[PDB]
Amino acid sequence: FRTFPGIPKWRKTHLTYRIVNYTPDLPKDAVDSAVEKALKVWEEVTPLTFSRLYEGEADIMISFAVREHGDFYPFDGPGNVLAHAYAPGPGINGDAHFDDDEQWTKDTTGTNLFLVAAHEIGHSLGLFHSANTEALMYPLYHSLTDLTRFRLSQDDINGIQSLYGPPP
Numbered sequence: 001f002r003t004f005p006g007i008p009k010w011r012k013t014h015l016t017y018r019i020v021n022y023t024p025d026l027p028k029d030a031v032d033s034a035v036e037k038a039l040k041v042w043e044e045v046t047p048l049t050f051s052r053l054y055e056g057e058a059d060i061m062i063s064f065a066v067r068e069h070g071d072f073y074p075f076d077g078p079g080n081v082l083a084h085a086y087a088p089g090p091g092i093n094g095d096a097h098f099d100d101d102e103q104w105t106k107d108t109t110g111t112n113l114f115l116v117a118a119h120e121i122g123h124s125l126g127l128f129h130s131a132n133t134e135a136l137m138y139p140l141y142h143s144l145t146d147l148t149r150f151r152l153s154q155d156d157i158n159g160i161q162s163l164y165g166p167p168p
């Protein structure tokens with residue numbers, strides 16, 4: 001696995017997130033679930049905990065957008081870049097943005113929001129890209145035949161634990 005240069009990481013174990021807005025593709029509940037599951041993935045292997053906020057600034061601000069969306073990294077329309085997030089830190093750092101120009105499905109027929117959310121969150125916590133192809137943190141998304149066979153690789157776990165340690 002690889003972490004970001006300088007090894008930036010949250011200096012606290014309890015992070016707040018806030019789904020700023022939703023995609024029209026899925027009902028609010030399918031979106032909420034996808035992100036709770038997303039975070040749960042990391043919560044299970046570290047001493048990290050998360051609480052949701054509806055107002056103000058959360059550590060991880062989550063939102064769906066297209067093309068120019070208020071940052072130095074515009075989305076590219078359909079395909080290619082699906083979403084992007086920022087390594088741990090203040091302000092925009094830690095936030096995750098999802099290209100709403102994709103078709104967010106809750107399965108593998110389009111772009112699965114659960115998986116993408118899971119990968120991007122890996123970035124919000126300090127994990128960069130892995131060279132292992134079976135690792136969630138691998139550079140490219142790929143159509144999983146099964147969402148029921150998904151699990152973090154020992155690599156993704158090794159990495160997150162090297163940063164926040166194992167769960168107490």
Ligand SMILES: C[C@@H](N[C@@H](CCc1ccccc1)C(=O)N[C@@H](CCCNC(N)=[NH2+])C(=O)Nc1ccccc1)C(=O)O
Pocket residue numbers: 079080081082083084085115116117119120123136137138139140141142143
């Ligand atoms: C770029 C950004 N977002 C990635 C997430 C990919 C991912 C991996 C594993 C699970 C879920 C999601 C992203 O959007 N990647 C694109 C490709 C970017 C290519 N850029 C480049 N080579 N310079 C991606 O995987 N796209 C894609 C689109 C349709 C189907 C399959 C994959 C990042 O993490 O740095």
Ligand SMILES: [Ca+2]
Pocket residue numbers: 058059060061089090091092093094095
């Ligand atoms: Ca933030």
Ligand SMILES: [Ca+2]
Pocket residue numbers: 075076077078079080081082099101102
């Ligand atoms: Ca795109």
Ligand SMILES: [Ca+2]
Pocket residue numbers: 023024025099100101102103104
């Ligand atoms: Ca969309």
Ligand SMILES: [Zn+2]
Pocket residue numbers: 069070071073084097
């Ligand atoms: Zn953005």
Ligand SMILES: [Zn+2]
Pocket residue numbers: 119120123128129137138139
């Ligand atoms: Zn990535």
